Nucleic acid binder design. Structure first.
Lengths: 203, 79, 42, 108, 174, 293, 62, 190, 141
RNA sequence: CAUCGGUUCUGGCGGGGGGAUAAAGGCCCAGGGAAUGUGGCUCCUCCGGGAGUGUUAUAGCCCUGGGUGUAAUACCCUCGC
RNA sequence: AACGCGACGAUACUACCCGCACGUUGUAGACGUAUAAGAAUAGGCUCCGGCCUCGUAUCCUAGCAGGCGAUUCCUCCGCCGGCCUCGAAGUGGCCGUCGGUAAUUCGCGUAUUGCAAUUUAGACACGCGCGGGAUCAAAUCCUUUGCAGACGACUUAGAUGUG
């Protein structure tokens, strides 16, 4: 447990409801949460069940005037996750509204979150939760099949971001290698008493 | 069936208080009625119960038959 | 080569074996001894 | 110059009041202390003094900053959340705000 | 059904003028405590003889501990359970280290697989399989095989439930 | 109970609401999709509707009844004075949609297009684009070069800004009409060079459209004001001396919900709607210089 | 009658678009593009080669 | 019941080169190269003997044990495809109107293309594009025969099925109208 | 018949496999009960690494790379102790990087405030030389 | 803040008693037995390992009785700090 | 979306911009509010030697809330300027100047806030200020139009003109 200024979560490989419950509990506890890559979230069960549930959601609409009061069906994966979170928070109170203002959801990793640390929640990871052999799906595929229009744009922006991250990774590998050679060189100049004291202390 | 692309009206699992009370009362009345028909029922009922027996896959069934036969002979000798 | 015919015509199919996932748990002689003991007990 | 901090307290968050499902009791508050995750860790901070520091409008006696004083009484549940009692019950708007758990009175 | 202990319960009918020395009946009963053990004794004795609790007495209740709790053993349990249809036999085998642990595994397995409660199961015999040729169930025969070594694929690492966020995606290979 | 005799809906739900259009000039909702292996070309233009007249056409339509015969048809005349390109807008793709990134204007803009930026042109000092015209001079148009290179590097959709020459029309309006016309074909650098070469130049209708082509006409219809249900939706008139009116709908509701639905015909605004009509054949592009067009 | 949104009608229209109307639209577009081309033809920081910066929010203010 | 260990064996000929990495099987042979993604089935691959591939499942159910047979047959069919190949001979028969079949190779797509004309006198011109690697020829030895050859059994059989399904009589008695294209022979190229 | 299979290679539970429990002690599998529990014995001379003979759930154990070679199934505590001192399981565990990490953890948690201050000072003293070496490396190449 | 009184929550430590005077288990002594048969021997072999034989050998295990032993520990009850 | 967003033009007025000069100004709540590979989980990482349960990690962390003077060091940080670079809601790299800077050691000062009382200390936004630099704008009523219209609203026109 650690209080942080803002927690950036990678939505890839995560289960929608478990991540939503954990994020909602953090929001009501008072922690700012930014979830990215909501198109890479996972729903347990194979794709036709999620498609059936979203079509059953689309079926529900107010009768006398569909421009007011009715369930507004959002086809974006980020706002699907936002609906999942909002169902878990008393959003009709001032406390729940203020908790929801501490949350930001995005598709892909827009800047400047591309140069920030993205953490994962092991209590909601699909690989650590689902039994092997069970079927699953992605929120992005369901969104694309129900009406999301920006699967390709987010995709191309993601290969651009991954290419820039690859260049950053070669730079980081070079920096780590030079740091290792610097430590090996400085091992012959640091005082042996200091080295022995640090090794005895655990460093 | 085209259920996935076009779902129908959902079947509600949220039961009503009227339905719950009516089902409970019909269940209690049925229990009383079957008790009455059990008391009035003229079908024959054996006093003894047909015992299922000993399983074949029990590995010491032969030794248990040995024990039963030995105790039978011992009881016959004692009597 | 394969000397016989297959009914569905998939001549490339291998000579499949029986689906016996409980193989190797009992030797043949032990099963025969258990058969004699079960028959005597019965 | 010194490049260090000046913190001698542990951070905490005011979660809610003592409550059932429906009925809340403002006289007792629930606090999540940073790094405390079980009752054995909460036992160290039983009896410590916790302060809620906030900022008002009018400057009274040289400052615009007010403090509500209280102390930790008993652990709550199994996850290191503690119960606290203050001189006045904490504001309901401060659910999620930060509080300071000081290291005094000390048994070390 | 809980932390079970096996008890020998010896009881008898109360002595009368006709029978100054009535017969003693001993049973081996798995029960969480001695009160439940005596209750089960009186139930099983009412099922077999003209003795009830008001006309009989408990001579002794003793705990039967396992001779070798550190030796891996195969147990065969013959039981009768009561369902909607009636009473049915079951023969099952468990690879455990004590008769009491075998009986707890039995109760959990029957509750999981046939929805049978403690009140509807009669434990008729619990025996030790002296030889591995007496093992009949294939799920124990695959455990009593020679040179049994297997890996453990897809081991989810144990991460503390109070640590919400981690900076590394965990691996499932250790 | 059910409706005894089946009858379809009066009116279409696809053209709701029946309100006045948000602005007078028609909005191009969608442009033709871009094929980069095509040559660069403009996809839209503007004109002013003059009226209608009659033609006789020698029809060559094999399989038709009037094949190799003469047909009388009605046609609509649109006056098209040449259009002046005065700008270039760049568009980028975002997960929230197309986004305008930069806009580069020409150095010299006419008073026609300058009147569009004012509601009182006669009281104004006419200061529009005066400080913008100096960035073509300072540092040899370095800022203009920066914005053009930004469009070449980051944008995927390029549109020119084109305005009508309204002084050539008989209209009393002196305020011109300005729109974005998408450049289709070529690469983005080709589109930027195409616009840069077309700044401050008049573009005629014959270089955008060609005879015997079907186009789409986008406009705002004739306004009718507040109109009742009988003419607004084509509903059946109630019989003579129907109480509280006969040019009405007898039942706006007889069934649950306890509301008036959005599908019930109600009195209100008719006309002045934004309409895009498709598949209109160009029969003749006549020239103003020709005295026998 | 076959619908407008029918697969066989769509395939027939696609074949018509590919084989018949396609060359006509391509030739007309080439002529119009040539006619419009007729009218069209008729340091990095200080020179604009280096594209520098022009002269709520996505993140929490901190 | 959860079986502790189950295994299958696939013998590999000397000409065949098999490379498996992360359940992505690549099989190389004299005729060509095949690639398949078996990442949807939990199998552990090994080399139990020189020239034998070992398939294993640990702590799997009966379904997981049974899926190894499908994996075994798929990899065996890939080996047979890269070694000997697969060949489907099809016959097209007609009653009154002769069926015209023209086979081309679209070079930009790099794939064969079969064009069928005059089926029951219909004026439509049917067109089937083949899977990559499937070679279609008109047999000169026999009459009204197509030959589909390849290394991928799935591709060859699916192309033959597409040819058979595209020429289907509608709204007529199938007892009386017997026309169509049918898969006559299924076998190996070598 | 060139077969290039690169696949995962798990450690296996077997008679002789040494387990590391959650408390930090070691055990050896002497008989496998099922796929979830084993019978184990930790007859180590060191009290910290010792484990009483009994049932070990495999969820609460970690597979160490140490396997006692040729250990009979179901061998009692004397035989397991003889095999332990013969094979030298303790020395191999000390060489294992897991015990080095655990020892580093104990050395870090056994620090007082004076120890932490001295750690900070000596770490800055070492960091000076590492920074000079890194600057020299970056300047040279 | 210190020293107290009433109520209460929680942690640690030192003893006692009971059971099969826990059951185990370690180390010895005296017997008996078997294989998921160790060493050895023999036969196959892709020589990597399998197959057969028999009771400890160049591993061990199980069963029974005795000693250390009034052993320890678990569990239950209890006296205090 | 009349409480979603973007680009552009002109911006009088104390209005706009720059610097420090501070707030009985406001903030669902600073206190080191430090940390960018992607991908797989029946496999990955690498410096190619090996390594992988483990973020229990790494960086930073000493001095009047952190002074003065040395001994000593060429390490770290920050402001500017140049060249590049960053469009998903746009910002980092290198070089150069300047300023600060225990990696080692020492001296002088700390008291008296009296035995605890938030450690009034950060950021953003806003206002009042001065001292300087920059710019001299529109909308509406009114008259008119009829492409419009119940009234508002809308399309026009009204400053020298092709009115």
């Amino acid at each position: 447990s650690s209080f942080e200024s803002v927690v950036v979560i990678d939505g890839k490989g995560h289960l929608l409801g478990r991540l939503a419950s954990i994020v909602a509990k953090q929001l009501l506890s008072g922690q700012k949460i930014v979830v990215v890559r909501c198109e890479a979230l996972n729903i347990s069960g194979e794709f036709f069940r999620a498609k059936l549930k979203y079509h059953a959601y689309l079926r529900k609409m107010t009768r006398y005037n569909p421009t007011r009061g009715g369930p507004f069906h959002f086809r974006a994966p980020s706002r699907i996750f936002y609906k999942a979170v909002r169902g878990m928070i008393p959003h009709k109170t001032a406390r729940g509204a203020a908790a929801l203002e501490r949350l930001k959801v995005f598709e892909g990793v827009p800047p400047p979150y591309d140069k920030k640390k993205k953490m994962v929640v092991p209590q909601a990871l699909r690989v650590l939760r689902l039994q092997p052999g069970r079927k699953y799906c992605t929120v992005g595929r369901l969104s694309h099949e129900v009406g999301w229009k920006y699967q390709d744009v987010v995709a191309r922006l993601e290969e651009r971001r991954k290419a820039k991250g690859a260049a950053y990774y070669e730079r980081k590998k070079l920096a780590a290698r030079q740091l290792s050679e610097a430590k090996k060189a400085a091992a012959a100049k640091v005082d042996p008493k200091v080295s022995e004291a640090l090794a005895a202390y655990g460093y | 069936a085209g259920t996935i692309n076009k779902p129908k009206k959902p079947t509600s699992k949220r039961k009503t208080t009227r339905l719950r009370a009516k089902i409970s009362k019909r269940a209690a009345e049925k229990k009383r009625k079957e008790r009455k028909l059990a008391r009035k029922n003229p079908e024959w009922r054996s006093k003894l119960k047909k015992d299922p027996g000993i399983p074949n896959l029990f590995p010491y069934k032969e030794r248990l038959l040995q024990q039963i036969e030995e105790e039978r002979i011992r009881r016959k000798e004692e009597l | 080569k394969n000397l016989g015919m297959r009914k569905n015509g998939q001549v490339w199919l291998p000579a499949k074996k029986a689906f016996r996932p409980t193989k190797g748990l009992t030797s043949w002689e032990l099963r025969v001894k258990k058969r004699q003991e079960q028959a005597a007990m019965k | 110059p010194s490049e260090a901090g000046h913190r001698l307290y542990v951070k905490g968050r005011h979660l809610s009041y003592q409550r059932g499902r429906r009925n809340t009791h403002p006289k007792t508050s629930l606090i999540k202390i940073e790094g405390v995750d079980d009752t054995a860790a909460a036992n160290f901070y039983l009896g410590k003094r916790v302060a809620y520091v906030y900022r008002a409008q009018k400057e009274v006696r040289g400052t615009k900053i007010r403090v509500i004083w209280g102390k930790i009484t008993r652990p709550h549940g199994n996850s290191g959340v503690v119960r606290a009692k203050f001189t006045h019950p904490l504001p309901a708007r401060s659910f999620g705000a930060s509080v300071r758990i000081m290291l005094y009175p000390s048994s070390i | 059904m809980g932390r079970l202990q096996e008890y020998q319960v010896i009881g008898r009918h109360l002595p009368t003028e006709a029978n100054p020395n009535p017969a003693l009946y001993r049973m081996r009963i798995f029960a969480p405590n001695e009160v439940v053990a005596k209750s089960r004794f009186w139930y099983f004795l009412r099922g077999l003889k003209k003795v009830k609790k008001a006309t009989g007495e408990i001579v002794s209740v003793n705990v039967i501990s396992e001779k070798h709790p550190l030796k891996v053993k195969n147990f065969g349990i013959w039981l009768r359970y009561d369902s909607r249809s009636g009473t049915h036999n079951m023969y099952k085998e468990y690879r455990e280290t004590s008769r009491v642990a075998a009986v707890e595994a039995m109760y959990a397995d029957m509750a999981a697989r046939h929805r049978a409660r403690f009140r509807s199961i009669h434990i008729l015999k619990v025996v030790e399989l002296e030889k591995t040729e007496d093992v009949k169930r294939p799920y124990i025969k695959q455990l009593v095989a020679k040179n049994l070594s297997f890996p453990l694929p897809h081991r989810v690492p144990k991460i503390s439930t109070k640590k919400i966020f981690s900076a590394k995606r965990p691996s499932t290979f250790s | 109970s059910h409706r005894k005799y089946e009858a379809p809906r009066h009116g279409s739900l696809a053209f709701l609401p029946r309100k006045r259009a948000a602005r007078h000039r028609g909005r191009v909702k969608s442009f033709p999709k871009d094929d980069p292996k095509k040559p660069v070309h403009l996809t839209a233009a503007m004109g002013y509707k003059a009226g209608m007249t009659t033609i006789v056409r020698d029809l060559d339509r094999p399989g038709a009844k009037a094949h190799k015969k003469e047909v009388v048809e009605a046609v609509t005349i649109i006056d098209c004075p040449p259009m002046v390109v005065v700008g270039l807008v760049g568009y980028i793709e975002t997960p929230r949609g197309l986004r305008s990134l930069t806009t580069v204007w020409a150095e010299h803009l006419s008073d026609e297009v300058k009147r569009r930026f004012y509601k009182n042109w006669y009281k104004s000092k006419k200061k529009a684009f005066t400080k913008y015209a100096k960035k073509y001079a300072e540092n040899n148009g370095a800022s203009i070069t920066r914005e053009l290179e930004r469009i070449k590097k980051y944008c995927t959709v390029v549109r020119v800004l084109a305005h009508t020459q309204i002084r050539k029309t008989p209209l009393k309006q002196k305020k011109a009409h300005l729109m974005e016309i998408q450049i289709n074909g070529g690469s983005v650098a080709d589109k930027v060079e195409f616009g840069r070469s077309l700044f401050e130049k008049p573009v005629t209708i014959d270089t955008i459209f060609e005879k015997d082509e079907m186009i789409d006409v986008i406009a705002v219809t004739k306004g009718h004001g507040f109109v009742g249900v009988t003419a607004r939706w084509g509903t059946k008139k109630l019989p003579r001396k129907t109480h509280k009116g006969l040019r009405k709908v007898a039942c706006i509701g007889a069934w649950h919900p306890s509301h008036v639905q959005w599908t019930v015909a109600r009195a209100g605004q008719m006309g002045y709607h934004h309409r895009t009509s498709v598949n209109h054949k160009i029969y003749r592009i006549g020239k103003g210089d020709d005295e026998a067009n | 009658a076959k619908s407008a949104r029918a697969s066989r009608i769509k395939e027939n229209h696609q074949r018509f678009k590919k084989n018949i109307a396609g060359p006509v639209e391509a030739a007309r577009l080439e002529r119009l593009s040539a006619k419009l081309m007729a009218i069209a033809q008729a340091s990095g920081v200080k020179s604009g080669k280096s594209i520098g910066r022009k002269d709520s929010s996505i993140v929490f203010p901190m | 019941m959860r079986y502790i260990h189950s295994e299958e064996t696939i013998p590999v000929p000397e000409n065949v080169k098999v490379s498996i990495k992360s359940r992505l099987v690549t099989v190389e042979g004299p005729r060509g190269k095949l690639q398949k993604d078996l990442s949807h089935i939990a199998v552990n691959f090994s080399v139990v003997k020189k020239g034998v591939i070992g398939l294993e499942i640990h702590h799997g159910s009966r379904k997981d044990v049974a899926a190894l047979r499908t994996v075994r047959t798929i990899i065996n069919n890939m080996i047979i495809g890269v070694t000997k190949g697969f060949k489907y001979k099809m016959r097209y028969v007609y009653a009154h109107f002769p069926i015209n079949v023209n086979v081309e190779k679209n070079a930009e797509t790099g794939c064969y293309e079969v064009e069928i004309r005059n089926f029951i006198g219909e004026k439509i011109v049917r067109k089937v594009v083949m899977a990559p690697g499937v070679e279609v020829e008109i047999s000169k030895a026999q009459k009204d025969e197509l030959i589909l050859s390849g290394n991928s059994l799935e591709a060859v059989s699916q192309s033959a099925a597409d040819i058979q399904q595209i020429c289907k009589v509608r709204n007529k008695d199938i007892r009386k109208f017997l026309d169509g294209i049918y898969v006559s022979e299924k076998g190996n190229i070598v | 018949a060139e077969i290039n299979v690169e696949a995962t290679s798990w450690r296996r539970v077997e008679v002789g496999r040494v387990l590391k429990l959650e408390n930090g002690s070691l055990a050896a599998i002497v008989e496998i009960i099922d796929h979830k529990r084993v019978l184990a014995d930790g007859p180590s001379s060191d009290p910290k690494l010792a484990t009483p003979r009994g049932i070990v759930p495999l969820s609460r154990a970690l597979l160490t790379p140490i396997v006692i070679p040729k250990l009979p199934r179901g061998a009692r505590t004397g035989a397991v102790k003889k095999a332990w001192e013969a094979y030298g399981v303790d020395a191999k565990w000390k060489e294992t990087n897991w015990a080095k990490k655990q020892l580093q953890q104990e050395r870090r948690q056994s620090l007082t405030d004076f120890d932490r201050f001295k750690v900070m000072r000596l770490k800055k003293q070492r960091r000076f030389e590492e920074r000079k070496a890194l600057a020299k490396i970056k300047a040279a190449a």
